[PDB]
From Swiss-Prot, chains A, B:
Function of the protein: Small calcium binding protein that plays important roles in several biological processes such as Ca(2+) homeostasis, chondrocyte biology and cardiomyocyte regulation. In response to an increase in intracellular Ca(2+) levels, binds calcium which triggers conformational changes. These changes allow interactions with specific target proteins and modulate their activity.
Tissue and organ expression note: Highly prevalent in heart. Also found in lesser quantities in skeletal muscle and brain.
Source organism: Homo sapiens
Transmembrane segments: none
General remark: Able to bind zinc in vitro; the binding sites are different from the calcium binding sites. The physiological relevance of zinc binding is unclear. Physiological concentrations of potassium antagonize the binding of both divalent cations, especially affecting the high-affinity calcium-binding sites.
InterPro entries cross-referenced by the UniProt entry: EF-hand-dom_pair, EF_Hand_1_Ca_BS, EF_hand_dom, S100-A1, S100/CaBP7/8-like_CS, S100_Ca-bd_sub
Protein name: Protein S100-A1
PROSITE patterns assigned: EF_HAND_1, EF_HAND_2, S100_CABP
Residue span(s) of domain EF-hand: 12-47, 49-84
Residues annotated for Ca(2+) 1 binding in this entry: 27, 32
Binding residues annotated for Ca(2+) 2, in chain numbering: 62, 64, 66, 68, 73
Length: 93, 93
């Protein structure tokens, strides 16, 4: 498998483990998601009031409007954040 | 950095290297994208006529309708495919 595929598997393992740790194993609640990204993602720095925006972005990602996310919503949710790291990269180099 | 972040960096390195290899370094053409995913992604098996759908999905991902993709479009483009691997996982176990 390509390195991209190797990296991809990582998303499932972390999603499954963290999701499994709290709440229903099958579903990840927003509360679990917020804690997951805040701790695991550099966004921790954005934990301040900026973190509130996290609530705002969930609405757009969730077509259901349910407030809950599925693996499909999660993969795109992290993908959007990934772009931010790219922005950060600009700061270095 | 979290494992997810470690895996995330992989997307940039592969995107940059492959994109850099052919065409403009700054932009990735669809032709380059098709070859990249076909070879690097298991989708290689789907290289058959199914591969044609690859053209169809690009239209939805590209808001511009330009036929070209940016890192932002690419990250979501791979994210959609990622879900397919999950489907594959069901076959195993
Ligand atoms: Ca859960
Ligand atoms: Ca939802
Ligand atoms: Ca290129
Ligand atoms: Ca485009």
């Amino acid at each position: 498998g390509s390195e991209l595929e190797t990296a991809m598997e990582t998303l499932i393992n972390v999603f499954h483990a963290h999701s499994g740790k709290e709440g229903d194993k099958y579903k990840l609640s927003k509360k679990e998601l917020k804690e997951l990204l805040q701790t695991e993602l550099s966004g921790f720095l954005d934990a301040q009031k900026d973190v509130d925006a996290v609530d705002k972005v969930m609405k757009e990602l969730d077509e259901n409007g349910d407030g809950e996310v599925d693996f499909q919503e999660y993969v795109v949710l992290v993908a959007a954040l990934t772009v931010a790291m790219n922005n950060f990269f600009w700061e270095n180099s």
